[PDB]
Design a protein. Sequence first.
Lengths: 211, 211, 211, 211, 211, 211, 211, 211, 211
Amino acid sequence: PEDELKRVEKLVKEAEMLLMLAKIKGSEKDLEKALRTAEEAAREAKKVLEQAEKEGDPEVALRAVELVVRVAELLLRIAKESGSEEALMTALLVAVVAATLAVRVLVLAAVQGDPEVALRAVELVVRVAELLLRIAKESGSEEALERALRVAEEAARLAKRVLELAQEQGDPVVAIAAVMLVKRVAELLERIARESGSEEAKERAERVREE
Amino acid sequence: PEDELKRVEKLVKEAEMLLMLAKIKGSEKDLEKALRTAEEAAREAKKVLEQAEKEGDPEVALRAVELVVRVAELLLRIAKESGSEEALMTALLVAVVAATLAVRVLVLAAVQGDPEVALRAVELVVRVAELLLRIAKESGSEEALERALRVAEEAARLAKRVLELAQEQGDPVVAIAAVMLVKRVAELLERIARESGSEEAKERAERVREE
Amino acid sequence: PEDELKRVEKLVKEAEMLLMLAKIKGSEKDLEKALRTAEEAAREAKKVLEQAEKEGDPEVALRAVELVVRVAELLLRIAKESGSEEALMTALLVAVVAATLAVRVLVLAAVQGDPEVALRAVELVVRVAELLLRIAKESGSEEALERALRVAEEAARLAKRVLELAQEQGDPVVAIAAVMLVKRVAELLERIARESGSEEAKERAERVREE
Amino acid sequence: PEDELKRVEKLVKEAEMLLMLAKIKGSEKDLEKALRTAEEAAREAKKVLEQAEKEGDPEVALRAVELVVRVAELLLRIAKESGSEEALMTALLVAVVAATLAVRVLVLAAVQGDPEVALRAVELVVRVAELLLRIAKESGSEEALERALRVAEEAARLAKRVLELAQEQGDPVVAIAAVMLVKRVAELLERIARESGSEEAKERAERVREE
Amino acid sequence: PEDELKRVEKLVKEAEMLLMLAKIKGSEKDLEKALRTAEEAAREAKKVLEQAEKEGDPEVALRAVELVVRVAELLLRIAKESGSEEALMTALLVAVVAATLAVRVLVLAAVQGDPEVALRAVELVVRVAELLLRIAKESGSEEALERALRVAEEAARLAKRVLELAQEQGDPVVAIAAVMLVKRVAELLERIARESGSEEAKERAERVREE
Amino acid sequence: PEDELKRVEKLVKEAEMLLMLAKIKGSEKDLEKALRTAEEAAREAKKVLEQAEKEGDPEVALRAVELVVRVAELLLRIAKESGSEEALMTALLVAVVAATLAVRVLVLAAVQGDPEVALRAVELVVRVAELLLRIAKESGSEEALERALRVAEEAARLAKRVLELAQEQGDPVVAIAAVMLVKRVAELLERIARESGSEEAKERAERVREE
Amino acid sequence: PEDELKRVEKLVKEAEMLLMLAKIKGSEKDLEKALRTAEEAAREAKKVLEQAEKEGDPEVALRAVELVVRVAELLLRIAKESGSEEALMTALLVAVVAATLAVRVLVLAAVQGDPEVALRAVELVVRVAELLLRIAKESGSEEALERALRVAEEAARLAKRVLELAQEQGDPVVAIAAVMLVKRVAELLERIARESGSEEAKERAERVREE
Amino acid sequence: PEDELKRVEKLVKEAEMLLMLAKIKGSEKDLEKALRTAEEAAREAKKVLEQAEKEGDPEVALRAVELVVRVAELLLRIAKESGSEEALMTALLVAVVAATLAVRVLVLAAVQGDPEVALRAVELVVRVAELLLRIAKESGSEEALERALRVAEEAARLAKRVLELAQEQGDPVVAIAAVMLVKRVAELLERIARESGSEEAKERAERVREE
Amino acid sequence: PEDELKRVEKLVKEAEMLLMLAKIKGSEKDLEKALRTAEEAAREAKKVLEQAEKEGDPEVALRAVELVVRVAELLLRIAKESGSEEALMTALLVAVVAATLAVRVLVLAAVQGDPEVALRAVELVVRVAELLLRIAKESGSEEALERALRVAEEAARLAKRVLELAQEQGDPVVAIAAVMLVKRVAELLERIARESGSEEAKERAERVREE
């Protein structure tokens, strides 16, 4: 049931409500249950995926996982208002998850032959990459920075795999978009390469800008 | 349904009718059921809010809460004719409620992006402040006096939060009105500061007149 | 609908017709159904008020109640031709009713802000007073005499309440008339004081002639 | 449903029709089924009360019971045309019933606070009294005569109880009527006292004329 | 609906048309369907009564029954042209019916208090009597002759019952007419007494000429 | 099921009906079964609590217990009409029960975090106190008087415990009301202190007026 | 319906009537309801626009908005007679509104291709500018002064946009008028530049006098 | 329902409104939601086609797809004002889509035998070709240039297929127009051949100018 | 359900759509799934027959089988565009099937007595014959040629059996048509006899032209 997705979505709104009230009247308990509501919202989000795998709906799978991204993003924000290393780590944990989950939404889209959803699954990986990057900035964690760049390249990589089941089904437009996707990853890696000395970003960009 | 609001409104009129007859023929039972009709009117008023939260109508929420203010105000008056400490305390209880309820109407207006309704929600807080002040005078309660001034400043405070989602939506006029709102609070606190020695009103006015 | 008022009015005319024929050909059955037609006319008259309360028409309310007075007055007359203690008591019952009903028409006129109709509602109380006085003479009932004088003073009293919502709406003429009303009550009570030894009328007149 | 009352009423009309035809063409079978139709009409009448108790309608209760009186009255008449001791006893049985049933309509009117209906319930007791008196004359039964006078006084008694919930609800007119009711009982008992030597009627009248 | 009466009436006209054509061109089939059309006309006529009983219209009842008389009269005539013992018996059957039906129209007129319609109902009985007399002459049936005289007296009898609800409603003119009605029955019975040796007519006339 | 509460409530109304009839016709058997109906009503009332404990509804718990108070109050009244020491003791027994039961409704409200219901539970204790006081006056029992004052103070005491889970949940209004509650207990104890020499009431009031 | 516009217009006249009477007899309540009538008139005015957007009538849109200007102008005047900072702020709020509303009437005129109405919409902006200037003088508000000059330049700016859809439709006359419009803005800004030291007006005039 | 088409159309107008306002006041958020409104308009446009396939309406199909072209064209324009590579790619994606969709509208027109709609479907392909050409110029993308020319020739090709079901249905005029269509493609390819060195356009024109 | 037939029919249209698109854009995969869609359409077609046997509908049976012919015919065409020996053999297999299936529709029509449907069943055999002939030409298969001629004669044969249950039910027209059917088979066999040297067609025509 996408009936659940609405549940998940409303939980998220509520978490955002608990956060928004929390900043207004300065309540550390609002912020706490906001964290917990978020956490629940994302738990259920993954229950919904897990059965959209054991069913045939990649559409449901994608909406579930992008809700999980939404939860991750909310966690990042709660972290910044709380100033909590914990909240920042849970933000990070939901982020690293969303990545491999998007990857699952993708492989489902391939098995079932739904190239437009696979594409979106790959974009989502990119979003997760961008989030990790954010988290990395907020925590100064040299590890989160590595995870980010990694996840980026791995999206650019899966883009080829999206183009590849595109060219099986004769749909050049999503396959062109699938190449446009690879170049905004090249670009992200280039934008990162410039600022923020990384002995890496340079290499990853160079070898994705080949692909 | 705003169909209910009309119910709530008519209950209130009736309560006012029972009060107005009560003063005319001097019936302590008219005054009693007037109190109880009022009380009901405000109960339902909050049922109506509670579902306007679980729905999307901040408009309904505001009309519900300002009816609750109306009920509070009626209770203050019934108190003064009865000379009841009880009626005065129930007046006070509906008043302290209306405050945090307006605050809820506000946070709903923010979540849903309705800055003109948020503004009115904040005015309402100010009205509640003014009511508390009245109640405080009638009961000589040194506590009600504190609640009043508090609630005032907290309205001036939320005014910034109204201006803040105003400047997100690019609506300077309600945001200007939102600054005009803060200065009639500064003024209320100044007007109170003068008469009625309060070691406080002075401070609150000084620090809101900064903001 | 004032469509009903015409119904009520025609019922009354018919009752008066049944009475007038009854005296002509000396029919005790004409007189009976005349009583019953009257009774109906007044029943409906009050149905019409009752909804003019639950609507916004004090105009309809007043015409309904003064029809009820008209019915009461007719009952007094039927009583005198029949020589019935019963008919005289039902005359009395519709009379004591009309009083508190006029009082309702009045409080409606106040809630809705219609000072000229309130005034007339108070006059009507006076008429009812005058009727009670009549009934009292016809039955020699020491109780009806008390009800009369009471109802009188209570009209003079409500006159202040008419003047009081007059001075809110800035209409000195009906408010002057509202003081002229109090003095013809003082006068009625004085006229009664003189003849018909009453240990009371004297007091009531003295204390209304203050007001 | 008052839908039933109309049923009960039409049954009664029909019974009266069967009676009226029966006298015209002299049919002892018309008179028989007239008795039985009557009997049914009153059965259902009490079913209708019984649920107006287990519901909240004293209005329905009163119309049901006064239909039962109507049935009783019809039975008295059928008795006189038939010359049946049986029909006269069933007349009596429905009469003695109607009494205690009116009493139930009354106590319902008290529980539910409907003083005008209680009043009518008490009048009804008086009617039943008057009926019993009739029945007593037709049967020369020294017992029916006792039941009559008894039931009379017991109505005058319940009149106080009507006045008593009148003075709780501040409705002096039905309470005055409630005293007028007691004096037509005093009167009935006086009218009976005179004719028809009864060592009793005298006492009952004396002690009710106190009350 | 009196809409039906027009139906019944037109059926009758048509039956009379089928009869009138039948005599002209000598068609035994015209005469047959004329009988059947008549029969229908009278069937519906009684359906119309039957619901005018279960409604409140004695006016409708009378027009229905006198149509039934009209049908009866038509049947008598068809009988005489056909020379049918059958048609004569069906003539007789509708005649004996119309009698007891008029009687029903009457008792309806009494229940509902419509003395002028009752009167006409009784006249109708007389007409039926006159018809029976005709039928009796045409068939030489010693039984039809008895039915006739019987029905006559029974009309004179019901005349008293018409006068009796006349004197309840104070309408001496229909009550005088109700006595004029009894004397044309006395007269009919006298006119029959003379010719046509009947050991009976004499007695019936003597005892109705008393009444 | 609150379906049961309605059962309990109707039993109570019926008990009150049996009592009200009992006073009217002076039936000691009505009064007896009124006692027993009351007793049942309160039995079931406690069954309903007992499962509202083993469920999560403090709302149901409170309505159940306040019905038990209602039953107690009815018993007090039946006692006074009967003049029974027994009925007065059973009145007392249901009263002393209701106290510790309210206390249970309270601790349920705490476990489940429902401060507004806890508050009402504490008021109820106060009502029970007031009842005990009544019972004490009617029986002159020096023991019932002690139980009363005790129960009073113990309510004032639990008020702190209500304020205490109020300040955990940040709801100052019920917590203010919770302090208003303590002062009407101080007041009750003061009102009792004055009249009715008690070497005690003085002390209890002094030490609660501290708190 | 332009049927509404007449409503709006008459409301405005009435407001002006309440104001004009208010100054004559010196009634602060006339002035109050004059403010409120004005306020309503402008509310409806915007309802009428809002549907002239969701319809195709820029003509209706312009008349609606210029009524809103009229309301704004009336508010300025009421402010000056009352001496109210509040009335002056509400004057200001309707003024700042009318500006962005005229802007909407304009963009509607563009979408629908009605260059003569767009022109008038831009003039209206200028009027609003002139009003703001007035308001600014009356309140000495350094902010209202900024809003004024701003709004002026923004009109001169939209004038180019009017000329631009003029030159698409080949209508040089409204386009010439559209350049004449820009120079009376240059002029207004110059007239303001001179008196009333503003470090700004100078710049705005210089850069619009380029355009 | 073509009721939807109007929806789609109005969405498009609104998008164009958001764009036109966006250029006027320079709002990057207007431009954003203009993009998104456009995107929606085209989503629904394809929902409408998708069911016009699963229904029998090629007329609905064509209007839906040409709305999709309209959306594509709007996207191209938004791209140029924003200077966004993203907006330009989404412009391109809706363009490449519209092509194969027109192709679907065509094959529907063939299955259902509607040669005039097929013709228009083929023109539409040509429009899409022209759009791609535009997009290609704006992005300098050597790939978009290939897609353009391709799509052109493929329209000229389907023109034969339009002529071919024309000659089945004996409609030479649309079939002549179908040959006129091929020559403006030859011409487009020739016009492109000249400017803008393409080693290709030459070949495609040569081999279509054969056909 | 003939609800299924529509399913079968739409599958066929779709197969034809996949074929028609396949020839347009030259897609060997369109042609493949067109074959498979066809194949399904015919599978279900036979499921529908199979239950129209186990039910009483020869009408359903005939529509099912002629859909199977339609599928066969489509397969022949797909074969010719693909140039597949396989597709041609599956064309042949559905053809040889349709024959013996028509034969079943026929024997059902006989058992159930529906001679007009039997006739059509026999025509269908002839169509199948004509198809086999086509297939035979396309494959040069000396075997398919034998099957064709065979199936032809066997239709002419069953024609006698159609005429034979015609003459049982007295319907000479379908029986005449049943003889007209035999002569277009004689004719088909004659037309084949001429061209395409067959040592056979001659004999079969000679011996059917006897019959």
